[PDB]
Symmetry: C2
Subunit: 426 residues, 2 copies
């Protein structure tokens, strides 16, 4: 049995008695087997070898804190490089094309939102900021409206392609609209909204255009280098594109808790910064929303991108997307009871069904240890393909079986969410 | 010479060619010698042995993501423990006394602010939130007002004790006031504001009381167990105390990027959470402000607190504070040209001088490789004692020498800060 600690021990336990417990924890208390590619997301690589790299890199820069460039210059140099490499993947202006680093993919979105808020509030003085984005967007956009007190307006989609209706959005352009969003790809259905034709509308109403490539990251960019044709534009080559998010801790396989927000020029990110010279403790200047920052993490991110190179994320994209498509084809050819959502061109595959109760089906799967992300409006579920789940041949026959087992069988919910949040500390 | 990367390499370089570069970086590009205890802050421990622990712990839980408790349960169990141990250090109600974990010490402050904003906006419906705090507070409080659009009102201090004037604050109690802050200790001067007598005023105007112990962390709490007398109350034993911040990545020696925010009951933190069931991608529920979170970091934090135990942070407090006091005494007995700021009872020591130009003095030191935090209003400087700088006997004779070398010698600055922020990516 493993020992728990309601409070600090009388005497500190040796390092040896610790790692033993660090293993007792992994070995004992059961969990979802991500190592066996049974989770849609969470772990995106899992390679014992890769982990070891970012582990020793962690050790080298364990104390690193981006708050102090004068003390940790190498970390500064490695960030300027990371952002630089990511900028080239999305073909940002080699001239004014700047960028910045963030923690989670969520912080990246909030910084693009704060950028537009304090921008339109500087060139238009909008006292009532208003952000508009697809319903298929990410909760990261729904947070910004809550925190910054902005007005978030959801826009419905095209029932056929499941993309975004570029017409309904026009009906929402106001004197308060500060930015328009285009998830590419979105989290729910993994389908890139019309971006190539969205960099034209942005130019019309002089509004900032943000692309939520947090999920796409190192897949969408390499779709072209992987040898895939008929692919829209999802980046700065689209003149109407302002900012672009990208999670390196996702499909970059970088240490969890590392993403990047990009811009077309510096005067934009200027509005995402915080400046307070008046402060007595000195004169703060957070490039992001955080004070002290985990230097090691970004270093581990820098090391993976080099160890992988441009050739790595190709053999990565080809593999991941390769499986996602094989998956899609199998649930079309076989498993006739399922319905693909739109035309997933990438590594994320979504689907639904009116013949079966998808809600119960999900439970039938989770009971077998396989966890698909449960969706709503419409009620569905998907599988974000990772290197681990890239061993798909198994869970294709698995889902068919489960579907075979299905057909062979004759109020304010706001208060509930808070409950399982408090339950994370007992 | 070290190789730089404007973009991803043609072919990924072997792990071996990476760690070599990871060392070339440390070895080559010069930096401030924190290992020699020449930095007031940044690195708080630096122990090769300790680092190794949190390094292998990192490896065990490298993929860990707090977004998925069902996948990483051990991380859940270790967080519930961490918060639990920290709660006991500050003597929170063993009944309703709850808590939560955060990234940087900054996020912890913002969550206490959002807590009060969405609280007074729920029980009083205050459309114009108003936060009041000492000028000696932290920039973390100045950020919340900027992001959440709250009104931050600074309050001056007592010219003699350098604490906070509990009278001037009374003159600011409004129908918009949502919380009062009490830095303990503050960053600028490392002097704990009157908290023992501040838990009485909080009860008067039924306002939430937040203690910024982000800097004090594992020092203030252990001041009593270290064998020190005549110590005010800086925690929940003060009935008027609502929330309390604490940076574990500071004096806890935990992996950088880990702090904790505490409450007296759950209904408080309830307001710091984010809830969005309406979201189509599912039903988000961020306990903090972040999406995906670095599980490894909190695990490394959990491992240090156990390896240290309650006996570790005593031999820690006794050592750190021991040096800070020896430092203070030496600049009083010797170095008659300096003036201690108030009565620093802890590990942080601040001072000033009218005889010498402190600004130039700071430069004289930084030129010798010794970096003290430059302060303003009043123009001064301090030294936050870490385990490394806890070898003080040296830099006491160093500062005297530098002072000896001193006396032996016959517009909108807002636009400037943004400059050195953009310069972090070239």
């Amino acid at each position: 049995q493993l020992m728990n600690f309601p409070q600090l021990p009388s005497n500190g336990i040796p390092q040896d008695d610790v790692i033993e417990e660090l293993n007792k924890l992994n070995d004992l208390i059961p969990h979802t087997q991500w190592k066996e590619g049974k989770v849609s997301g969470a772990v995106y690589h899992g390679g014992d070898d890769l982990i070891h790299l970012q582990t020793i890199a962690y050790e080298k820069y364990c104390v690193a804190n981006q708050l102090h460039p004068d003390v940790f210059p190498a970390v500064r140099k490695m960030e300027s490089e990371v952002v630089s490499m990511v900028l080239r993947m999305f073909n940002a202006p080699s001239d004014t094309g700047c960028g910045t680093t963030t923690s989670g993919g969520t912080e990246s979105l909030l910084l693009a939102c704060l950028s537009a808020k304090m921008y339109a509030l500087h060139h238009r003085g909008i006292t009532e900021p208003e952000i508009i984005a697809p319903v298929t967007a990410h909760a990261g956009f729904d947070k910004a409206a809550y925190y910054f007190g902005m007005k978030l307006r959801h826009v419905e989609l095209d029932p056929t392609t499941y993309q975004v209706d570029l017409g309904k959005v026009k009906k929402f352009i106001n004197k308060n609209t500060v930015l328009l969003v285009g998830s590419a790809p979105n989290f729910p259905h993994g389908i890139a909204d019309d971006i190539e034709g969205l960099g034209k509308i942005a130019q019309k109403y002089k509004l900032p255009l943000h692309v939520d490539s947090c999920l796409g990251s190192f897949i969408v960019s390499f779709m072209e280098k992987a040898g895939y044709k008929n692919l829209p534009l999802l980046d700065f080559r689209v003149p109407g594109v302002t900012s672009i998010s990208c999670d390196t801790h996702k499909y970059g396989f970088a240490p969890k808790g590392s993403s990047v927000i990009m811009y077309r020029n510096s005067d934009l990110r200027m509005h995402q910064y915080y400046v307070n010279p008046a402060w007595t403790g000195g004169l703060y200047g957070s490039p992001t929303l955080a004070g002290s920052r985990p230097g090691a993490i970004v270093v581990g991110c820098w090391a993976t991108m080099v160890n992988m190179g441009e050739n790595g994320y190709i053999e990565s994209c080809q593999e991941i997307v390769g499986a996602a498509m094989k998956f899609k084809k199998y649930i079309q050819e076989n498993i006739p009871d399922l319905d693909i959502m739109g035309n997933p061109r990438y590594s994320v595959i979504s689907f639904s069904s009116k013949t079966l109760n998808i809600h119960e089906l999900s439970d039938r799967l989770s009971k077998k240890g396989w966890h698909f992300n449960a969706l709503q409006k419409p009620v569905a579920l998907h599988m974000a393909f990772t290197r681990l789940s890239a061993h798909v041949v198994d869970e294709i026959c698995d889902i068919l079986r489960t579907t075979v087992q299905e057909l062979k069988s004759e109020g304010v919910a706001d208060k509930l969410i808070v409950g399982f949040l408090d339950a994370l500390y007992k």
